[PDB]
Design an enzyme around this catalytic site. Sequence first.
Site, PDB file in Angstrom:
ATOM      1  N   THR D   1      41.011  46.621  35.534  1.00  0.00           N
ATOM      2  CA  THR D   1      42.040  45.592  35.621  1.00  0.00           C
ATOM      3  C   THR D   1      41.470  44.281  36.152  1.00  0.00           C
ATOM      4  O   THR D   1      41.204  43.354  35.387  1.00  0.00           O
ATOM      5  CB  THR D   1      43.208  46.035  36.521  1.00  0.00           C
ATOM      6  OG1 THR D   1      42.698  46.490  37.780  1.00  0.00           O
ATOM      7  CG2 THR D   1      43.996  47.153  35.857  1.00  0.00           C
ATOM      8  N   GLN D   2      41.289  44.206  37.469  1.00  0.00           N
ATOM      9  CA  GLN D   2      40.753  43.015  38.116  1.00  0.00           C
ATOM     10  C   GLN D   2      39.284  43.152  38.488  1.00  0.00           C
ATOM     11  O   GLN D   2      38.517  42.198  38.327  1.00  0.00           O
ATOM     12  CB  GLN D   2      41.569  42.683  39.369  1.00  0.00           C
ATOM     13  CG  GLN D   2      42.994  42.234  39.079  1.00  0.00           C
ATOM     14  CD  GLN D   2      43.061  40.844  38.476  1.00  0.00           C
ATOM     15  OE1 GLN D   2      42.088  40.091  38.510  1.00  0.00           O
ATOM     16  NE2 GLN D   2      44.216  40.497  37.919  1.00  0.00           N
ATOM     17  N   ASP D  59      40.184  52.236  32.376  1.00  0.00           N
ATOM     18  CA  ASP D  59      40.881  51.463  31.355  1.00  0.00           C
ATOM     19  C   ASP D  59      40.693  52.087  29.980  1.00  0.00           C
ATOM     20  O   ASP D  59      41.631  52.125  29.175  1.00  0.00           O
ATOM     21  CB  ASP D  59      40.388  50.015  31.364  1.00  0.00           C
ATOM     22  CG  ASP D  59      41.180  49.133  32.307  1.00  0.00           C
ATOM     23  OD1 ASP D  59      42.181  49.614  32.876  1.00  0.00           O
ATOM     24  OD2 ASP D  59      40.804  47.955  32.478  1.00  0.00           O
ATOM     25  N   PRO D 105      43.498  41.684  32.859  1.00  0.00           N
ATOM     26  CA  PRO D 105      42.666  42.029  31.703  1.00  0.00           C
ATOM     27  C   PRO D 105      42.205  43.475  31.736  1.00  0.00           C
ATOM     28  O   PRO D 105      42.114  44.106  32.791  1.00  0.00           O
ATOM     29  CB  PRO D 105      41.479  41.069  31.830  1.00  0.00           C
ATOM     30  CG  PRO D 105      41.362  40.842  33.296  1.00  0.00           C
ATOM     31  CD  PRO D 105      42.775  40.839  33.826  1.00  0.00           C
ATOM     32  N   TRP D 107      39.184  45.733  31.332  1.00  0.00           N
ATOM     33  CA  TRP D 107      37.734  45.597  31.387  1.00  0.00           C
ATOM     34  C   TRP D 107      37.059  46.565  30.425  1.00  0.00           C
ATOM     35  O   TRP D 107      36.377  47.501  30.852  1.00  0.00           O
ATOM     36  CB  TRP D 107      37.225  45.820  32.812  1.00  0.00           C
ATOM     37  CG  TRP D 107      37.391  44.621  33.691  1.00  0.00           C
ATOM     38  CD1 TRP D 107      38.470  44.317  34.466  1.00  0.00           C
ATOM     39  CD2 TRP D 107      36.453  43.554  33.872  1.00  0.00           C
ATOM     40  NE1 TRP D 107      38.260  43.131  35.127  1.00  0.00           N
ATOM     41  CE2 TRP D 107      37.029  42.641  34.779  1.00  0.00           C
ATOM     42  CE3 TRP D 107      35.181  43.283  33.359  1.00  0.00           C
ATOM     43  CZ2 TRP D 107      36.377  41.479  35.183  1.00  0.00           C
ATOM     44  CZ3 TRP D 107      34.536  42.127  33.761  1.00  0.00           C
ATOM     45  CH2 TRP D 107      35.134  41.240  34.664  1.00  0.00           C
TER      46      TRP D 107
END
Lengths: 140, 226, 203, 216, 237, 237, 238
Positions: D1-2, D59, D105, D107
């Site tokens: 994510t981050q 992810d 986002p 990754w």
Amino acid sequence: IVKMEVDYSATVDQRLPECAKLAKEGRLQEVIETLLSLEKQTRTASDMVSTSRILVAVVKMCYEAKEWDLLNENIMLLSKRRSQLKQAVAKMVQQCCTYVEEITDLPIKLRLIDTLRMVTEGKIYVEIERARLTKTLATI
Amino acid sequence: FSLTTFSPSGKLVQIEYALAAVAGGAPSVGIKAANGVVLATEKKQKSILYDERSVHKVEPITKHIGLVYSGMGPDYRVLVHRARKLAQQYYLVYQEPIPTAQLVQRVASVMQEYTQSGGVRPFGVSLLICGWNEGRPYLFQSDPSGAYFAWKATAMGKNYVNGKTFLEKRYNEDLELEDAIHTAILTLKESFEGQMTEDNIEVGICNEAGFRRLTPTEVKDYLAAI
Amino acid sequence: TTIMAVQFDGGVVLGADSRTTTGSYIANRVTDKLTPIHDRIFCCRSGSAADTQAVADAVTYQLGFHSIELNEPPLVHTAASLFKEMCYRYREDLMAGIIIAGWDPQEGGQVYSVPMGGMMVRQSFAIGGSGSSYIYGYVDATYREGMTKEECLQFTANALALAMERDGSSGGVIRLAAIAESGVERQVLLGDQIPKFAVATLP
Amino acid sequence: TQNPMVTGTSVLGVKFEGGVVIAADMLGSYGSLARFRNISRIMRVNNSTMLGASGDYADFQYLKQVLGQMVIDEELLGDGHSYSPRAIHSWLTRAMYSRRSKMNPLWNTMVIGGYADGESFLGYVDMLGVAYEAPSLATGYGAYLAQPLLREVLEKQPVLSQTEARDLVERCMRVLYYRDARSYNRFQIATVTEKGVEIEGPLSTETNWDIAHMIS
Amino acid sequence: GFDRHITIFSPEGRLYQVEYAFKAINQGGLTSVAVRGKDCAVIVTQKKVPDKLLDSSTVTHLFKITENIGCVMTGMTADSRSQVQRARYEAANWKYKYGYEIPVDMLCKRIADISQVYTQNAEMRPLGCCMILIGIDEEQGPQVYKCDPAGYYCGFKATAAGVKQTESTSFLEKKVKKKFDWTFEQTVETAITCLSTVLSIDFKPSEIEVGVVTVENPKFRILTEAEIDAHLVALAE
Amino acid sequence: NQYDNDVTVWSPQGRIHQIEYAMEAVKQGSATVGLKSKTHAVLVALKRAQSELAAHQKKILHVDNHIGISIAGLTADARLLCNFMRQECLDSRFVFDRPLPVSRLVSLIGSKTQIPTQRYGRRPYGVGLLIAGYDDMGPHIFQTCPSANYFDCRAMSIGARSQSARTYLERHMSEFMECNLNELVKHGLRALRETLPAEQDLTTKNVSIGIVGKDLEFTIYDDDDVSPFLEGLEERP
Amino acid sequence: GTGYDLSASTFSPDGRVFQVEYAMKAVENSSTAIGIRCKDGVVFGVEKLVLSKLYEEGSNKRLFNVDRHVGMAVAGLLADARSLADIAREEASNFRSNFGYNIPLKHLADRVAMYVHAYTLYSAVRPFGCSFMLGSYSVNDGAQLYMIDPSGVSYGYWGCAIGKARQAAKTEIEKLQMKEMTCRDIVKEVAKIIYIVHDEVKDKAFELELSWVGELTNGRHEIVPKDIREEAEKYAKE
């Protein structure tokens, strides 16, 4: 009363006389117990003629091996187990009535009162009362 | 519509039916004595199958606020739960006033979510409140639609009329000590059909020391010598 | 701290250290890091202790409710799915490394790993925590296939002991949990019972 | 994510006459750590589409779950249609773009291979929503190392045969293992063709170290 | 009008909707009996299975709400399952919010509060299913409670619900008035003979499903065919 | 009749009455036919005119290059369905760059229209839809009734006196797969012409044609575009 | 009823919900269905009335695929039936996303039944006019088959039927000896039972939609190959 589920006429025919030979003098109670298991199986299968034959055979074995006391608690257990089939117990009482009248003996009075106690639990007008009348006359 | 509703010309027909319902049959007398307040009620369980230590008619909302009620017990449960939450919120906001009798009037006033927001169907229970954290006792009644009445002695049962008549004839009075609970039991006796016993009769007392629901031992002790 | 799981025939064995560090001070030297998620499923926690406890309790909630609504013990895979969902949806806020293992009649002894990020993987053995990074070579070299219950128990105890003695954030006592169809047996190794490889460097 | 914690290293793939082959090693890099050595970064989208990813493996697992669920829902209707690999590539592109727009986002850099309507397709989508299709594709350091060999092969041979294509993929995997820190000597090779998607498994590449004697 | 059509107070001062919803429990053709004992609490309900194409494995009316609380439902099966699901959710949520397991009285209180909210308002309707929940509680012995479509949660020692609930309650009142505590044989036999006297089929050990919670053995044992058959043989002896 | 007042309420005899009335909304509308082929789907709609001065209104609505619909019934909540279908097809185009297959679109429409049939205060969408589309499995013709129960059809017609068109289509549906574009369009024109009374006859101004094919995107033909199809009418009113 | 049968929130004077008592009538009126649990799987079967030959090959099929291993054979109001099938598909997808693996059939049936009961509880919404069987198979849990009435609850069924003629189908279903017969002969027999039930005696020609799930299909509930089960339909015809 209730529909028959699983008949064991072949099983009783092939095994009951062999059981009688195996316990000709009645010294074995495992034979009595295994026919109790067989008649319980036929009872859960809701068969009347097989149970009646088993009970008649059991009392006949007790007649021939003349165990009067063991007859008393045996018929008590048979009549009190779950009440079984009313046709079968009414039969068994009938051959018991036919047998107690031929041997004089001292404790036939005990046999008469024992069957009286077994039949006096109710079910008088239904499922044979002439036996109880004859037993009372026999006691007289 | 979704509030306390059904008010025709000069009437509150739904509220009047709610009051016909709260006529009930549990007398639930209350007496405001000089030392404190007694809220006594009748627990006449159907048959002996039910239990008396399982469910209660008298509920301590907080330290010295006790509550008794009338018909529609299921509604009374939700109402007493709401009252407990409201008293707890007030005590949390105004922290540590030991708020009972300076709160008994306030909790009775906040019994406006009780009826002024009825909830389509108004509540069918009228409840008596007792508090004694002011140096003086307080007995209030909130009905299915009204507000605080600040009674001194009343009943809310099937024979509440003759119960109140008994209370006034027996002189609820003002000098009566805390043990006017004898008179409360007598008033229940009038609206009682049976040899009342410790589990049959449930009573709570709120004096200046606090509130306490009397256990069957003391209830039977008081019922003895009656 | 260090947490470790091994899968053997008919069950699993879990080993965790009892230390939880805050800066350089020992907050709790007897930490119970083997949280029973269910009767036959256990959790090993690493990282933020508060976050690990919250995630474990929420998953215990959901898993017990799910097992009750099925009238059947839950799968270890199902529990690991619950943990991966919980960790992945809140990874940016929740930073925790979790090792899940247990026994179910559907498959048997199972071990899963859900580190920070929210990924699930099934492994023969699992290792995690701050002190894990110091026994990777030992755990990989000294692990056999088809190891029995006692072999796995001793091997996990040794791995935890060395992770404790090497890592500064690990210490105290060792908690072992053997999970199988018979049930779960939890034991504690303390003091002298700790398997020690003494380092007597010559003068 | 981050900020990814467990990252998957490079993945590549090339299309040939009548099919496509992709390859990804089985290492989950927890930074500089080879934490997970037996994980699959290749997913079977359907019977005729494959997908690999490089980056945060959590992810990748989430995308695998979502995409498999949507493929199952699509096949449940029994309408005869399917998610063509072109459509799958567009859907992943939109998902990555939406995540970037939401500033959460994903990754992962993803390579989508497929062979439908008798024509091979090989898609590519990254974290920033940039997508396209090329005969040869690679991710991360693979696009720096393995990609030039694919480009120089395809410049002289626009079309390829399956056997030499997979040999070229194996050689590129050998090069990546030689000169990538995050790489590992255990890669899965998945081939999509008219017959379907077949994954070989834990394949390994032979290492050469004769030049080790050239140190002195 | 609409006094008897919606959940509003009658002009006579009654609530007819819940009065109808209680008779809804009698509708459906079933009965259940709950007997608290000296140390255990046993509940039994008949298992009316029409035709054997059904799965007798899953036709049950008794469930585990948690590891120590078991319920039996009486009334419409859909509302029964909805309330069972709600009770399981409440038990789990209580165990999450508070560490210790939810006492059976508190669970019955919460279910009764939900039902009271249902009889409040007018958009929804009360659920036509009366639930009898039992469980062992420390410092309390066995505990049995009944929540009804109204919200009145009570009931103890011997309590029954269903079509012929009045006759069962009368017989159990006779039995409890006979001052003798029931052990973990007399409680079960008392429940069995109560339900048999209510509906004399002599209870072939397949048409009832009994749940038991003892003190030395916690948990809601849904006694198997062998156990119920053994108890029936012992009773009819 | 009480039970016919609202959509939510259920008739004692069985199916509810408001939905049955909703199908009368599509019955009370200008006729339209739609037939499949081996490679093309054609819709022939009767553009009903208010008066000779006013235009013949608009039928055969446009949805996408490969999907076109024909409405028959309540025009108010019909442009709404057209907007919904256009939005869904554009959403599919936006997400995975492929034409939304007609079957999935029809399932979406059925699910969308099902909810008003159960939500109080929401009338069912009394609009009859003849969706013509070309997915990868050749042309498709679907009929959507306000009861939200769609159907697939080789050739179906809806509207006033559409039963005669239905009978003609059924009798001639055997020779539908192997027909040229003009032949199939003339089949549809004969089917629609058999609907109106003998006084009425097909004109370039009162008919609309919607054709979608493998290489031919959906196109709405009218007077000048229809005249080549209208030739060779074989007029037997 | 008269006065009390207007909204499901209104209880009857005897304590009954007449809205659902009428919603059951729609299921009783619609065309029938049948599902038999074979020894190693579950076989569905539904006759569908081709109301007009204008329709294409069997469409709006009474069979549906709610999940990979789970199938739904529905009867009654078909639009609401399809909406409920979509609800079941969403429930299965959500369970797979949350807990992983595949949704057990008992839990799926319980959840969809609770949803249906939620729709019959209130007043603004109306009870669903459909009854459906959910059939599934897996190696671990064998084959299960749960039937949900428009307002009732899921019940385990060895063999069940719903629709126009429930008793007529159930008599021959109970005549058939399940639990030892493979799914192939069960496919033959379900078509036989459907053809025994009236198809054209008062109605049009009917189509035979038959469904599979079992170890012969390793789960993966799919429609039986109709080309090879046309001979099964022929055996049913004889």
